[PDB]
UniProtKB/Swiss-Prot annotation, chain A:
Taxonomic source organism: Escherichia coli (strain K12)
Gene Ontology biological process terms, A to Z: cytoplasmic translation; ribosomal large subunit assembly
Molecular function GO labels: large ribosomal subunit rRNA binding; structural constituent of ribosome
Up-regulation conditions: Part of the rpsP-rimM-trmD-rplS operon.
HAMAP family found in the cross-reference section: Ribosomal_bL19
Record-annotated disulphide pairs: none
Stated family: Belongs to the bacterial ribosomal protein bL19 family.
Entry keyword set: Ribonucleoprotein, Ribosomal protein, RNA-binding, rRNA-binding
Protein name listed in UniProt: Large ribosomal subunit protein bL19
Role description: This protein is located at the 30S-50S ribosomal subunit interface and may play a role in the structure and function of the aminoacyl-tRNA binding site. In the 70S ribosome it has been modeled to make two contacts with the 16S rRNA of the 30S subunit forming part of bridges B6 and B8. In the 3.5 A resolved structures L14 and L19 interact and together make contact with the 16S rRNA. The protein conformation is quite different between the 50S and 70S structures, which may be necessary for translocation.
Subunit text: Part of the 50S ribosomal subunit. Contacts L14. Forms two bridges to the 30S subunit in the 70S ribosome, contacting the 16S rRNA. In pre-50S ribosomal subunits interacts with RsfS, which may inhibit association with the 30S subunit.
InterPro entries for the chain: Ribosomal_bL19, Ribosomal_bL19_CS, Ribosomal_bL19_sf, Translation_prot_SH3-like_sf
One annotated Gene Ontology cellular component of this protein: cytosol
Swiss-Prot record, chain B:
One example of a Gene Ontology biological process annotation: cytoplasmic translation
HAMAP family membership: Ribosomal_uL3_B
Key words, A-Z: Methylation, Ribonucleoprotein, Ribosomal protein, RNA-binding, rRNA-binding
MF GO annotations: rRNA binding; structural constituent of ribosome
Name the UniProt record assigns to this protein: Large ribosomal subunit protein uL3
Pfam families (UniProt xref): Ribosomal_L3
GO CC entries: cytoplasm; cytosol; cytosolic large ribosomal subunit
Keyword Transcription regulation: no
Purpose: One of two assembly initiator proteins, it binds directly near the 3'-end of the 23S rRNA, where it nucleates assembly of the 50S subunit.
Annotated source species: Escherichia coli (strain K12)
Transmembrane regions listed in the UniProt entry: none
Quaternary structure, from the entry: Part of the 50S ribosomal subunit. Forms a cluster with proteins L14 and L19. In pull-down experiments interacts with CedA.
Residues that bear N6-succinyllysine: 33
Record's comment on post-translational modification: Methylated by PrmB.
Curated annotation (Swiss-Prot), chain C:
Protein's name according to its UniProt entry: Large ribosomal subunit protein bL17
Pfam families in the cross-refs: Ribosomal_L17
PANTHER family on file: LARGE RIBOSOMAL SUBUNIT PROTEIN BL17M, RIBOSOMAL PROTEIN L17
Domain of life, source organism: Bacteria
Family under the similarity heading: Belongs to the bacterial ribosomal protein bL17 family.
Keywords: Ribonucleoprotein, Ribosomal protein
UniProt source species: Escherichia coli (strain K12)
Function: Requires L15 for assembly into the 50S subunit.
Amino acid sequence: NIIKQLEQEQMKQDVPSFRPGDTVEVKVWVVEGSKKRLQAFEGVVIAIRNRGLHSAFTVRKISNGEGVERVFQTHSPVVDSISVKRRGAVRKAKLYYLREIKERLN
Amino acid sequence: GKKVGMTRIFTEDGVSIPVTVIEVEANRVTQVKDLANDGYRAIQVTTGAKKANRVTKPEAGHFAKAGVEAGRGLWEFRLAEGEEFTVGQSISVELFADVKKVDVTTVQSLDVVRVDAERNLLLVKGAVPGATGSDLIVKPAVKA
Amino acid sequence: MRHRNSSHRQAMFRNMAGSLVRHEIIKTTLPKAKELRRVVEPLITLAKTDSVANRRLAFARTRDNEIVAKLFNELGPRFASRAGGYTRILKCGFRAGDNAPMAYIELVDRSE
RNA sequence: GUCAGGUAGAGAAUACCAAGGCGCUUGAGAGAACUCGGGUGAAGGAACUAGGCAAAAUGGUGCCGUGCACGCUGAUAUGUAGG
RNA sequence: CUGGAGAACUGAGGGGGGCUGCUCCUAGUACGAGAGGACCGGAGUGGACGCAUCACUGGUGUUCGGGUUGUCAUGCCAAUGGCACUGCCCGGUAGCUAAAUGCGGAAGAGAUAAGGAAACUUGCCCCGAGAUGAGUUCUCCCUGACCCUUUAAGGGUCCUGAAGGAACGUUGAAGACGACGACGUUGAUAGGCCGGGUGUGUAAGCGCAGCGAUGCGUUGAGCUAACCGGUACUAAUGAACCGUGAGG
């Protein structure tokens, strides 16, 4: 209860609802010397770890030649906004098999 | 104090600091040692509470002598000839506000992140020995 | 560092749990009786509420139609008002064969 | 040396059953200070050694590539070439 | 300056330790006839070794959950369970492990040698009274009778069982030699019954269409061990044993 009370105010309630296998765009702050820039990352969510303040999700992006995986901390200040583009119709909690999708229309 | 789990805090700039969160009730003095009797300067302090039926009266009489309520365990720290304390005095966590490095028992030179008195809570950057619910002793860093 | 094989252990508790329900009391070694509780009461708690799914799951455990019939009919209502602690263990000396601590484990019933 | 059923399978291998034959002539609790033997466990996959030995990987065939098909077919045909 | 217990301190002595390299400010400075260009101190950034070590980053997890091949039992089909290495493959919420994260070596003081240095003796961290000036400081409990009597730490009989601790039972993440952390009925430590979160990602049953193999509604639902937040109507209960009664 001490831990929970400490993290409730640190957590943010503006977290959008997304599911594994969804196409997600996430904006992340970037520091270059003395300037703050907003970087846009496009990818598909392949894993979500729910632990409250420590909740995180993995996004895989197919870059020019090879894929890139990126683990974001949902409640970190670095991430500003998260938007969902497609509602992937998968039936697995962790989509690790994409290393080596339908659309839900709901 | 008592160790109560572990968590992390996110700063405005973005970096996240893993913090050990220690709950520290008001520490109330029970005995004061001096050169005349004990040959050294130290204060004996207690914390927490103990069941009346379980606390043996040899300690209860010792606690009652100082007007102190029976706590769990006893610890004492040596003085630096620059401070004075009186029997029965209550010590809270605000004393750590002015110090940035603390020693947790020993893991030494740990940054202090936040201190508050309304909730009797102290925060330390890093990990400290022992599992949750264990007893810890926090003192200012000696290696200045 | 802890801060029978699995199959044999699971089968034994399944059999012993069924025998306990059928007879309301059984004589067994004290360690077995203590470990049997963590398998026995959960069955009675499920039997407190009756449903098609619960009946099927209760059958999947103990794999016996007689026990399921025994449950959900009188063990359910007889323990509806009781919140846990449906079992009682009485130590009864040691087994003469190998000096094993023996104890009767019996459901809190049979007050006739 | 002979007699050795059903399903799956190329087979006399192996797994799962009926009939028949049995629990092998010390047991009940507690967990590993790693003496022994398997499966799994990040990889610059040789940073070990005289020797990548023993393991692991591997094996097949609804086959046109010197990669593809693979467990089920409303229907073609409520069983197609045919003994 | 030897009565019988439960704690907090003083720390002699002994053991593990005195990491390394680079850049920036000091500074186009000192030395040298120019160029080249400091050393030390301070600050910051890597790697190696050791203690602590999980809120966050990975892997593993023979109990729960999802999917499935060959065969069999439960008088049946559907729906399950057991066996074939955990049947094989893909994950995860507690406990155990590091790549990551975090801390420690440096500075100060008395005594150096050579001609006032990273070595010795310290400061920092862990342990410490079977270290005999013989239990410091603080606290709790105790003021009970007759004979023999060579009349003195002698023996015998009767009465008493405190403080505190141990055993048995519910727990043992201190790593199985276990007297150890707490709690044991003014009682939530463990084994259950609920609620919440995470993981699994569309179960059983019913209904419409195709009258098949799937998918949708029912339903982000069902289930979920060692853990989080509550509740004693179950069980740790009530008698002993051990240790004494004013201290040369």
